[PDB]
Design a binder for this molecule. Sequence first.
Ligand SMILES: Nc1ncnc2c1ncn2[C@@H]1O[C@H](COP(=O)(O)O)[C@@H](O)[C@H]1O
Ligand SMILES: Nc1ncnc2c1ncn2[C@@H]1O[C@H](COP(=O)(O)O)[C@@H](O)[C@H]1O
Ligand SMILES: O=P(O)(O)OC[C@H]1O[C@](O)(CO)[C@@H](O)[C@@H]1O
Ligand SMILES: O=P(O)(O)OC[C@H]1O[C@](O)(CO)[C@@H](O)[C@@H]1O
Ligand SMILES: [Mg+2]
Ligand SMILES: [Mg+2]
Ligand SMILES: [Tl+]
Ligand SMILES: [Tl+]
Ligand SMILES: [Tl+]
Ligand SMILES: [Tl+]
Ligand SMILES: [Tl+]
Ligand SMILES: [Tl+]
Ligand SMILES: [Tl+]
Ligand SMILES: [Tl+]
Lengths: 327, 327
Amino acid sequence: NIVTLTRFVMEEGRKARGTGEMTQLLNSLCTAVKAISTAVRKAGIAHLYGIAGSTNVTGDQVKKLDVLSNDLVINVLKSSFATCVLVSEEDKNAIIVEPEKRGKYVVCFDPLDGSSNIDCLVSIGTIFGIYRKNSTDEPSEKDALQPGRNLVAAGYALYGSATMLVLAMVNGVNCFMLDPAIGEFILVDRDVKIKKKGSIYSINEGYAKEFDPAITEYIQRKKFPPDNSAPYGARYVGSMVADVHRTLVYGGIFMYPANKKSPKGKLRLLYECNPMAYVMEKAGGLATTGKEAVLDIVPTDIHQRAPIILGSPEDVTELLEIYQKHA
Amino acid sequence: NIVTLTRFVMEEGRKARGTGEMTQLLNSLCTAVKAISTAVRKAGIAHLYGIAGSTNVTGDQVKKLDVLSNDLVINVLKSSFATCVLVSEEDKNAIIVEPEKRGKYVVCFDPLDGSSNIDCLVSIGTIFGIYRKNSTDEPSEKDALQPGRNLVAAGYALYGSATMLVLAMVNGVNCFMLDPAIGEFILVDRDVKIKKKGSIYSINEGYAKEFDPAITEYIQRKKFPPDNSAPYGARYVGSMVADVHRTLVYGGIFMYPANKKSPKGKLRLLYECNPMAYVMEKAGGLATTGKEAVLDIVPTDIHQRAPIILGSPEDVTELLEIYQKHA
Ligand SMILES: Nc1ncnc2c1ncn2[C@@H]1O[C@H](COP(=O)(O)O)[C@@H](O)[C@H]1O
Ligand SMILES: Nc1ncnc2c1ncn2[C@@H]1O[C@H](COP(=O)(O)O)[C@@H](O)[C@H]1O
Ligand SMILES: O=P(O)(O)OC[C@H]1O[C@](O)(CO)[C@@H](O)[C@@H]1O
Ligand SMILES: O=P(O)(O)OC[C@H]1O[C@](O)(CO)[C@@H](O)[C@@H]1O
Ligand SMILES: [Mg+2]
Ligand SMILES: [Mg+2]
Ligand SMILES: [Tl+]
Ligand SMILES: [Tl+]
Ligand SMILES: [Tl+]
Ligand SMILES: [Tl+]
Ligand SMILES: [Tl+]
Ligand SMILES: [Tl+]
Ligand SMILES: [Tl+]
Ligand SMILES: [Tl+]
């Protein structure tokens, strides 16, 4: 009873009595992630280095991995005929879908996240969040300004040692492994739940000078626990999709809080924070700014930033108590 | 012209007037690394999950990633007819090659490192160090107990967003990107040199309570710089090969010093520290225990551990001066 993502998605659409438009959109997304994975793994790189001659144009201008991944997502998504508005980290304004290709969905995505890790080959990934068009007027940027609570689907693809697509919908989270020998995502983990308490903390301690008193206290607690329990281990890949995936599967906490220089945090609400907050809540974990659920935030700009703390419910509640403690 | 790793080692063997044994050893390593990469990226995994029913298996005989990598390196190394003693992290005793397949080389390797990161799909890698047998006695474990200074070649493969093989020899360090479309490593960065000073520090701060006063002062300095420069960013993937590769390519410093449960450090001298210390010094970087050069330690146990600090010379030197001050 092997379950490919293609068959999973078709069946959830049948169970939900969908008309086939959201199924097609998820099929197209699966296709774009496979194409991005292949480019990320550098298939055909020998051509760029002149294996078939013409090795003089080394002068970088040939589509960077980032620009290519964005082109794939946009073109594949438009070709699904299921979207009307697209929001991408790469584009200043929302992309409005042409009338002929227009569907009812709104898609926020980060085509390739973990940009500082690209050149050192560290894990990177793709993040997406899917909304249903809310108004009845002309599609525009305002259709992407819905709180995360209105998400129909969200998840990510991780381009790590292997490629995995994690997909969250109303009934739960499932993890599919890419078999690159046949171009098929295989269900390997069903209805995933995060553990109640972890033993790993994930944050860039280089900002220690700019952290707030609550974050400062919490970290001290992880290293020197007052009850003398075992100190947490530390992990910070520096790519959000990889640190968050580890969090989902191993437990613990992930933090990118505001700080003195980034008073609103660094991560983007629409296509970084909301999708992972959605994956985390559907797995039994939490996602907070420290004062409110990420998913309940009402966006006001498509490139708006928000602080985020996510992970095991007990670890996140502990930091929240510390925020309350500090008034 | 385009340069494959195959062409590179062959021409390097010709220039050195070798008999071809070391060339054959290096080509075998390159074959083992391709086969491990393909397994790591999960090609064929659908078969495990029953895409073809249950019949392609007589029993429960299946192998963990780590067991499979170990078996690929041992069997492919042996078949090169170039080795006489192998040391693997996975075997308590040195492996002595049968006389019929004996060559003059001693190889120390970690077939798959970063085991804590395997189930969460973070970057993992293969590490290797190569020595010439310096004796006329029957081959034995003692032939592996040489200081890293005696290495003839070392390096690693990183299975990250893409697969890369980094090879260091007497003349310098080179990086080859694997093109999985054609099964060819392609030379992409020549005679690599680390930056003299970096801006990233890499360590598990979870062990904060067990750190010596010099590591403690250094980390504080990275977060609250006396000259008021910008603090370093922090990165810690949790896989030595990923963190060391970022160090090489971006600069800065990587640390695993002694702690509680590792009063002599955690990382293994023969097949973790020495290969990385050799790449670093050949790249113009430094590698020290805090008190002496990693490459000059004379081992007495194939599985002995050592503390290690490595990376950009101005950064490692700064920490060495802390240690000297305290003393
Ligand atoms: N493949 C699917 N998987 C999960 N839910 C689906 C699927 N197809 C449709 N749905 C649900 O049914 C709604 C309407 O689908 P549609 O008619 O395709 O726009 C969607 O917004 C989802 O809530
Ligand atoms: N492909 C090669 N690349 C670099 N050095 C090599 C190569 N082949 C041989 N050498 C050097 O020449 C020595 C003798 O080689 P061999 O006769 O093959 O054992 C080796 O120990 C190396 O120091
Ligand atoms: O170096 P910093 O400030 O920790 O930023 C890293 C974060 O930025 C991102 O690259 C987003 O731009 C995330 O993937 C990652 O979590
Ligand atoms: O969890 P810790 O103690 O930081 O150990 C991390 C180290 O463990 C290893 O997995 C052991 O080889 C290294 O790859 C890594 O640098
Ligand atoms: Mg991003
Ligand atoms: Mg190891
Ligand atoms: Tl961004
Ligand atoms: Tl970007
Ligand atoms: Tl991006
Ligand atoms: Tl960001
Ligand atoms: Tl092991
Ligand atoms: Tl290992
Ligand atoms: Tl180790
Ligand atoms: Tl080890």
